[PDB]
Write a protein that holds these residues in place. Structure first.
Motif, PDB file in Angstrom:
ATOM      1  N   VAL A  70     -20.200   5.185   2.061  1.00 50.49           N
ATOM      2  CA  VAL A  70     -20.605   4.998   3.454  1.00 50.49           C
ATOM      3  C   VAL A  70     -22.127   5.004   3.569  1.00 50.49           C
ATOM      4  O   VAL A  70     -22.720   4.180   4.281  1.00 50.49           O
ATOM      5  N   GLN A  71     -22.782   5.926   2.860  1.00 51.88           N
ATOM      6  CA  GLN A  71     -24.239   5.996   2.881  1.00 51.88           C
ATOM      7  C   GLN A  71     -24.867   4.740   2.291  1.00 51.88           C
ATOM      8  O   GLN A  71     -25.895   4.264   2.783  1.00 51.88           O
ATOM      9  N   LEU A  72     -24.282   4.208   1.216  1.00 55.42           N
ATOM     10  CA  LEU A  72     -24.801   2.967   0.642  1.00 55.42           C
ATOM     11  C   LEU A  72     -24.725   1.823   1.644  1.00 55.42           C
ATOM     12  O   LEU A  72     -25.682   1.048   1.787  1.00 55.42           O
ATOM     13  N   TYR A  73     -23.598   1.702   2.351  1.00 57.52           N
ATOM     14  CA  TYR A  73     -23.497   0.674   3.384  1.00 57.52           C
ATOM     15  C   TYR A  73     -24.554   0.872   4.460  1.00 57.52           C
ATOM     16  O   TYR A  73     -25.209  -0.088   4.883  1.00 57.52           O
ATOM     17  N   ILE A  74     -24.734   2.114   4.915  1.00 64.73           N
ATOM     18  CA  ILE A  74     -25.726   2.390   5.953  1.00 64.73           C
ATOM     19  C   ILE A  74     -27.118   1.995   5.479  1.00 64.73           C
ATOM     20  O   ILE A  74     -27.898   1.392   6.224  1.00 64.73           O
ATOM     21  N   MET A  75     -27.444   2.310   4.226  1.00 65.62           N
ATOM     22  CA  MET A  75     -28.806   2.120   3.745  1.00 65.62           C
ATOM     23  C   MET A  75     -29.087   0.671   3.361  1.00 65.62           C
ATOM     24  O   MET A  75     -30.254   0.265   3.319  1.00 65.62           O
ATOM     25  N   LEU A  76     -28.055  -0.132   3.093  1.00 59.27           N
ATOM     26  CA  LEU A  76     -28.281  -1.497   2.628  1.00 59.27           C
ATOM     27  C   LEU A  76     -27.782  -2.586   3.572  1.00 59.27           C
ATOM     28  O   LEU A  76     -27.943  -3.768   3.254  1.00 59.27           O
ATOM     29  N   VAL A  77     -27.179  -2.244   4.709  1.00 61.86           N
ATOM     30  CA  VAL A  77     -26.812  -3.276   5.676  1.00 61.86           C
ATOM     31  C   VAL A  77     -27.437  -2.971   7.033  1.00 61.86           C
ATOM     32  O   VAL A  77     -28.224  -3.767   7.556  1.00 61.86           O
ATOM     33  N   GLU A  78     -27.031  -1.893   7.705  1.00 60.13           N
ATOM     34  CA  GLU A  78     -27.689  -1.458   8.965  1.00 60.13           C
ATOM     35  C   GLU A  78     -28.945  -0.737   8.518  1.00 60.13           C
ATOM     36  O   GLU A  78     -28.926   0.503   8.502  1.00 60.13           O
ATOM     37  N   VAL A  79     -30.016  -1.437   8.252  1.00 57.24           N
ATOM     38  CA  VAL A  79     -31.213  -0.921   7.595  1.00 57.24           C
ATOM     39  C   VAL A  79     -31.967   0.049   8.499  1.00 57.24           C
ATOM     40  O   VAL A  79     -32.515   1.053   8.029  1.00 57.24           O
ATOM     41  N   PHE A  80     -32.043  -0.252   9.797  1.00 54.20           N
ATOM     42  CA  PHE A  80     -32.845   0.586  10.730  1.00 54.20           C
ATOM     43  C   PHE A  80     -32.149   1.924  11.019  1.00 54.20           C
ATOM     44  O   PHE A  80     -30.904   1.970  10.943  1.00 54.20           O
ATOM     45  N   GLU A  81     -32.915   2.972  11.358  1.00 53.79           N
ATOM     46  CA  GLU A  81     -32.351   4.328  11.630  1.00 53.79           C
ATOM     47  C   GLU A  81     -31.573   4.311  12.952  1.00 53.79           C
ATOM     48  O   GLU A  81     -31.884   3.447  13.790  1.00 53.79           O
ATOM     49  N   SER A  82     -30.610   5.217  13.149  1.00 58.68           N
ATOM     50  CA  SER A  82     -29.730   5.153  14.350  1.00 58.68           C
ATOM     51  C   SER A  82     -30.314   5.935  15.525  1.00 58.68           C
ATOM     52  O   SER A  82     -31.113   6.858  15.276  1.00 58.68           O
ATOM     53  N   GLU A  83     -29.919   5.593  16.754  1.00 54.59           N
ATOM     54  CA  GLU A  83     -30.487   6.270  17.937  1.00 54.59           C
ATOM     55  C   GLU A  83     -30.126   7.750  17.904  1.00 54.59           C
ATOM     56  O   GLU A  83     -31.075   8.563  17.965  1.00 54.59           O
ATOM     57  N   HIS A  84     -28.828   8.077  17.787  1.00 57.77           N
ATOM     58  CA  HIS A  84     -28.320   9.476  17.830  1.00 57.77           C
ATOM     59  C   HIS A  84     -27.870   9.925  16.443  1.00 57.77           C
ATOM     60  O   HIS A  84     -27.343   9.079  15.722  1.00 57.77           O
ATOM     61  N   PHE A 104     -18.023  -1.393  -2.492  1.00 55.27           N
ATOM     62  CA  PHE A 104     -19.420  -1.002  -2.200  1.00 55.27           C
ATOM     63  C   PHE A 104     -20.321  -1.287  -3.405  1.00 55.27           C
ATOM     64  O   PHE A 104     -21.444  -1.791  -3.184  1.00 55.27           O
ATOM     65  N   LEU A 105     -19.866  -0.984  -4.622  1.00 52.03           N
ATOM     66  CA  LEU A 105     -20.731  -1.171  -5.813  1.00 52.03           C
ATOM     67  C   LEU A 105     -21.121  -2.646  -5.872  1.00 52.03           C
ATOM     68  O   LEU A 105     -22.285  -2.932  -6.211  1.00 52.03           O
ATOM     69  N   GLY A 106     -20.200  -3.535  -5.517  1.00 51.92           N
ATOM     70  CA  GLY A 106     -20.475  -4.979  -5.588  1.00 51.92           C
ATOM     71  C   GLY A 106     -21.590  -5.408  -4.660  1.00 51.92           C
ATOM     72  O   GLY A 106     -22.427  -6.211  -5.099  1.00 51.92           O
ATOM     73  N   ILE A 107     -21.596  -4.918  -3.418  1.00 52.56           N
ATOM     74  CA  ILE A 107     -22.620  -5.359  -2.424  1.00 52.56           C
ATOM     75  C   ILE A 107     -23.997  -4.954  -2.950  1.00 52.56           C
ATOM     76  O   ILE A 107     -24.898  -5.804  -2.898  1.00 52.56           O
ATOM     77  N   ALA A 108     -24.138  -3.766  -3.536  1.00 47.74           N
ATOM     78  CA  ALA A 108     -25.439  -3.394  -4.143  1.00 47.74           C
ATOM     79  C   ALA A 108     -25.798  -4.320  -5.305  1.00 47.74           C
ATOM     80  O   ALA A 108     -26.976  -4.690  -5.396  1.00 47.74           O
ATOM     81  N   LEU A 109     -24.837  -4.687  -6.148  1.00 47.82           N
ATOM     82  CA  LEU A 109     -25.132  -5.516  -7.348  1.00 47.82           C
ATOM     83  C   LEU A 109     -25.564  -6.922  -6.922  1.00 47.82           C
ATOM     84  O   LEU A 109     -26.524  -7.438  -7.527  1.00 47.82           O
ATOM     85  N   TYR A 110     -24.916  -7.508  -5.910  1.00 46.99           N
ATOM     86  CA  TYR A 110     -25.327  -8.843  -5.397  1.00 46.99           C
ATOM     87  C   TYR A 110     -26.740  -8.759  -4.844  1.00 46.99           C
ATOM     88  O   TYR A 110     -27.541  -9.659  -5.125  1.00 46.99           O
TER      89      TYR A 110
END
Lengths: 338, 53, 275, 213
Positions: C109-123, C184-190
């Protein structure tokens, strides 16, 4: 024409260099070689202050040695309480680029300034219990680098457009302007008599200014880079300053000559802030090597290193009673040593 | 130019201001050192009984 | 006995028994070495104040859960002569081995957060992270106890049971987590090949993959993809596939310490300042 | 009791605890241009309006701050470089008046090569590009400059020439990438391009941690 006269009066001595070599016997080191060294000075952190959000550029103490103020790039001023680590007042700002602070001797006003080229004076004690802007002084052309108080109704400022000025707070207009530099001005110090003051420069030179009459009386040189900080020995007859060439020096006024130098071989990075002690025996200096050194003024060797800041130390301060050392670095934690 | 005249006048007024011997103006700091050498806390440590702060 | 007992669904009957000794010694050594390296990291992630973010909490909680689970496994899996001890020990092992897998899913989940929704969240979400890592392992235990509770202790080992198909309360969630962590490992490798092989390359396709073999190898420890080797043990000739489980999954604390605690610049500097 | 003032000391702390999530969610980019670059028209046509000026807006619930300095880039001192927290520097330059490209290129070289701006990205805007089609047929680029090899009548050759000259004086490898566009008065797509060019410079910082390089 006039160039020949200038060269004769400057390059050919004419009491500007000949009179310098007619007052020194051998060196002050001969006189001071009869004083034992201070020894080993070890200091610790007594209290740590937290709450800021960004880097810190300036701070100032108070007359009672209990309350202090500090500025940050966030754009807020906090009036602390060093005894109990309690916040008393927090004042916002209109501009986030702030470089100076002040604290009135009567403890009723607070001054601030920065890259907006305008000085702001806020009132502390008033009816209804709230802090509001009281004075908004403008008219400069460069950018403020230092501002200090004289009383409740007079304030002195120095700018980056090679000028210094004195103001009347009640009306809002200048009274005297001190011109005559070549480079920018980075510091300013007030003598402990409210009669004169001293200003550095970016042309490796310093000058002493008279308040009432309004002209320079003495100019000193002897550096090779920008001069950063300046202060007074606590008697009104000497001062000391550092530069980006990583070298510190001490200057006098009556003899009108340079006396002592402080340097080493591994000191490559320069100095930022300078402060003295009560008896003049403890010179404290801040560098950008994440540390802060202590030299004894009479000698030319170190006696203490103040480590504990993760980032570069930017501001240094000592009290009036004599029991504190306040440090502020590029992180958001003020430190108190005793 | 007026700048050259102002510089010449400043140099002239910055030369005849008298001086003093370096030893006499350099022993003043040494004297001031022991003038107030007992009221300096950071130099001579004080007993911790003076309040817990 | 052995470590593959946790992920085994069918019993095995060897012949000329020599492999059991070599399956037990490795398990002992691996757990003993991992427990030491799994405590040095808890202090690192909970004492220093510079290294405080939304990713340190996940590592800290995963380490704590793994430590508790391994200690319980070492202490209480041969106390078969006592039923009351075995029931509670099996329940605790189930809970504290499900918590670790949930905290492993939070890493993807953290990898997805850090590599797709790049900007920090409001709350902030640092509280919700605690309601999913320690909330699901409570409801799962609750329903498992509700359905059949007496099946918490076997005649030989002491955990769950395989005649009533009750070990599928730990295997199903584990395989689901593994299958998601693979996506998830795949999205980082691409992203690691495309972006840094189109933005700062030049003429020449000299296998960009080699420039980042490490890190890619390091993520395998956190994602826990090796446990799948436990599913491929269904025969006496297929020992080579359970042999490697006891060789890599027992030595997980060692890898998670030597990759994320003693092979990074920020932690090395934090140690150097203290030194 | 006088010791019951701690409530006040608490009430301030909460006030400084609610704004800690507004600094971590902030992006600041520094604008730089020239007298004829077209700073005023570009600034005014973005649904937004002595010293340093500040503008604040938001694109897709993300704060953005524009810091504009009016004619004070000549300050070569080191104390003025307090812009170490900026994420990007946006340079604007014209492309129709060929007589003033050399000074602009020198200014760009001076700005980039400073050591402080080593962890920031550079965005490049070439203004006009609409007067360039109607002007290239009367003035030959081979006169003022002599390094061009392509045909001095096709717009593609001169565009590539300008981009190459601008990009060939960025030294010290590439810690962060450089970008460039071709817009004059779109005022509808300029915001999106900046948003898409500042997201990438955060991926190139996030991937560094997840790679150990």
């Amino acid at each position: 024409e006039l160039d020949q006269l200038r060269q004769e009066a400057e390059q050919l001595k004419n009491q500007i260099r000949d009179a310098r070599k007619a007052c020194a016997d051998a060196t002050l080191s001969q006189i001071t070689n009869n004083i034992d060294p201070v020894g080993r000075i070890q200091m610790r952190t007594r209290r740590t202050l937290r709450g800021h959000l960004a880097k810190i550029y300036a701070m100032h103490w108070g007359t009672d040695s209990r309350l202090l103020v500090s500025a940050s790039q966030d754009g807020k001023l906090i009036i602390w309480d060093s005894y109990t680590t309690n916040k008393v007042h927090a004042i916002p700002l209109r501009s986030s680029w702030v470089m100076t602070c002040a604290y009135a001797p009567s403890g009723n006003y607070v001054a601030c300034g920065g890259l907006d080229n305008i000085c702001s004076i806020y009132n502390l004690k008033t009816r209804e219990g709230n802090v509001r802007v009281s004075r908004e002084l403008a008219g400069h052309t460069g950018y403020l680098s230092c501002c200090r108080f004289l009383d409740d109704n007079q304030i002195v400022t120095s700018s980056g457009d090679t000028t210094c000025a004195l103001w009347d707070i009640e009306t809002g207009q200048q009274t005297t302007t001190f011109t005559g530099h070549t480079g920018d001005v980075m510091s300013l110090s007030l003598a402990p008599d409210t009669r004169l003051f001293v200003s550095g420069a970016c042309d490796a030179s310093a000058k002493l200014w008279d308040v009432r009459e309004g002209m320079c009386r003495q100019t000193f040189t002897g550096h090779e880079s920008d001069i950063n900080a300046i202060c007074f020995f606590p008697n009104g007859n000497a001062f000391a300053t550092g530069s980006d060439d990583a070298t510190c020096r001490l200057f006098d006024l009556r003899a009108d000559q340079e006396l002592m130098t402080y340097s080493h071989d591994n000191i490559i990075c320069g100095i930022t802030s300078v402060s003295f002690s009560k008896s003049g025996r403890l010179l404290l200096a801040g560098y950008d090597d994440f540390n802060c050194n202590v030299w004894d003024a009479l000698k030319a060797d170190r006696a203490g290193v103040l480590a504990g800041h993760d980032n570069r130390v930017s501001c240094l301060g000592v009290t009036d009673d004599g029991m504190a050392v306040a440090t502020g670095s590029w992180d958001s934690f003020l430190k108190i040593w005793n | 130019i007026a700048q050259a005249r102002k510089l010449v006048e400043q140099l002239k007024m910055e030369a005849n201001i008298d001086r003093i011997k370096v030893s006499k103006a350099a022993a003043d700091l040494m004297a001031y050192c022991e003038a107030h050498a007992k009221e300096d806390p950071l130099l001579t440590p004080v007993p911790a009984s003076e309040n817990p702060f | 006995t052995n470590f593959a007992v946790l992920m085994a669904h069918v019993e095995v009957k060897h012949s000329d028994a020599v492999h059991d000794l070599l399956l037990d010694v490795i398990t002992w050594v691996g757990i003993l070495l991992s427990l030491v390296c799994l405590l040095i990291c808890i202090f690192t992630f909970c004492f220093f104040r510079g290294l405080q973010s939304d990713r340190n909490t996940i590592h800290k909680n995963l380490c704590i859960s793994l430590f508790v689970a391994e200690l319980l496994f070492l202490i209480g899996i041969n106390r078969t002569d006592q039923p009351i001890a075995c029931a509670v020990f099996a329940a605790l092992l189930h809970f504290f081995f499900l918590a670790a897998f949930t905290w492993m899913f939070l890493e993807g989940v953290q990898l997805y957060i850090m590599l797709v929704e790049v900007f920090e969240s409001e709350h902030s979400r640092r509280k919700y992270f605690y309601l999913v890592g320690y909330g699901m392992p409570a409801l799962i235990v609750a329903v498992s106890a509700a359905v059949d509770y007496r099946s918490y202790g076997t005649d030989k080992v002491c955990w769950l049971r395989l005649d009533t198909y009750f070990i599928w309360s730990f295997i199903g969630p584990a395989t689901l987590i593994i299958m998601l962590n693979v996506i998830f490992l795949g999205i980082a490798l691409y992203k690691m090949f495309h972006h840094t092989a189109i933005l700062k390359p030049e003429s020449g396709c000299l296998d960009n993959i080699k420039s980042w073999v490490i890190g890619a190898i390091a993520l395998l420890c956190l994602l826990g993809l090796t446990w799948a080797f436990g599913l491929m043990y269904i025969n006496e000739s297929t020992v080579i596939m359970a042999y490697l489980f006891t060789i890599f999954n027992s030595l997980q604390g060692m890898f998670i310490f030597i990759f994320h605690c003693v092979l990074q610049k920020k932690v090395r500097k934090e140690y150097g300042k203290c030194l | 009791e006088d010791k019951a003032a701690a409530e006040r000391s608490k009430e301030i702390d909460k006030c400084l605890s609610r704004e800690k999530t507004y600094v971590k969610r902030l992006v600041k980019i520094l604008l730089l241009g020239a007298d004829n670059s077209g700073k005023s028209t570009f600034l005014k046509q973005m649904r937004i309006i002595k010293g340093i000026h500040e503008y604040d807006f938001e694109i897709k619930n993300v704060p953005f701050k524009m810091v504009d300095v009016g004619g004070q880039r000549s300050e070569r001192k080191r104390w003025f470089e307090c812009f170490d927290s900026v994420t990007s520097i946006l340079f604007l330059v014209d492309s129709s008046d060929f007589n003033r490209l050399t000074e602009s290129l020198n200014d760009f070289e001076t700005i980039v090569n400073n050591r402080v701006f080593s962890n920031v990205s550079i965005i490049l805007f070439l203004n006009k590009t609409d007067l360039l089609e109607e002007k290239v047929q009367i003035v030959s680029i081979k006169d003022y400059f002599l390094e061009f090899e392509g045909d001095p009548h096709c717009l593609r050759d001169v565009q590539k020439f300008l981009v190459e000259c601008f990009r060939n004086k960025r030294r010290d490898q590439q810690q962060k990438p450089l970008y460039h566009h071709f817009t004059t008065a779109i005022n509808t797509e300029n915001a999106r391009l900046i948003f898409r060019d500042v997201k990438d410079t955060i991926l190139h910082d996030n991937l560094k941690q997840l790679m150990l390089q």
